[PDB]
């Protein structure tokens, strides 16, 4: 054969692959459709199917998603990292539960979508790194000690039992509301 023995697999299903998945899938579905590739794969990984069900549920529950997206990019881009980092810290203040984990990725994924629809192409990768870095540096720790991404995949994945579902609901009740003041993206 031409290759194979001299070719190793690139990009494992790690956080980078997961962040590129959710954001890719979302962007590819509403913005970066021409750039088919990131969201070329569906929910099959032990985190993919988890985030997919998360975002979907939160996307339906969050009556304020694309608002802050416009609010931020209403004046001018670039200085979006400070806005993002502010709300991110407020989100990680004391409750990075799976209930909030949804909004964590959803915030950037939605942001990125509207960024590809506007003059914020380079900003997309920034939000992607701001997200993956904040996560890998602090979110991952909470996640690893809590139950892991696998726990989240069981919570709302194939084995999404009624107990796991009500668990997420009761969870976000105390966690998403305690950090509900992270609306620093709400500008004009």
From Swiss-Prot:
Primary location: mitochondrion
Transmembrane segments: none
Membrane protein topology class: Peripheral membrane protein
Keyword hit for rRNA-binding: no
Keyword annotations from UniProtKB, A to Z: Acetylation, Apoptosis, Membrane, Methylation, Mitochondrion, Phosphoprotein
Localization of this protein: Mitochondrion membrane
GO molecular function: channel activity; disordered domain specific binding; identical protein binding
Entry-linked Pfam families: Bcl-2, BH4
Motif (BH1): 90-109
GO biological process, one term: spermatogenesis
Entry GO CC: Bcl-2 family protein complex; cytosol; mitochondrial outer membrane; mitochondrion
Modification N-acetylalanine, positions: 7
InterPro entries, per database record: Apop_reg_BclW, Bcl-2-like_sf, Bcl-2_BH1-3, Bcl-2_fam, Bcl2-like, Bcl2_BH1_motif_CS, Bcl2_BH2_motif_CS, Bcl2_BH4
Residue ranges annotated as motif BH2: 141-156
Tissue: Expressed (at protein level) in a wide range of tissues with highest levels in brain, spinal cord, testis, pancreas, heart, spleen and mammary glands. Moderate levels found in thymus, ovary and small intestine. Not detected in salivary gland, muscle or liver. Also expressed in cell lines of myeloid, fibroblast and epithelial origin. Not detected in most lymphoid cell lines.
Residue span of motif BH4: 14-34
Domain of life: Eukaryota
Recorded domain comment: The BH4 motif seems to be involved in the anti-apoptotic function.
Function: Promotes cell survival. Blocks dexamethasone-induced apoptosis. Mediates survival of postmitotic Sertoli cells by suppressing death-promoting activity of BAX.
Family: Belongs to the Bcl-2 family.
Quaternary state and interactors: Interacts with HIF3A (via C-terminus domain). Interacts with BOP.
Protein name, as recorded: Bcl-2-like protein 2
Source lineage: Eukaryota, Metazoa, Chordata, Craniata, Vertebrata
Gene: BCL2L2
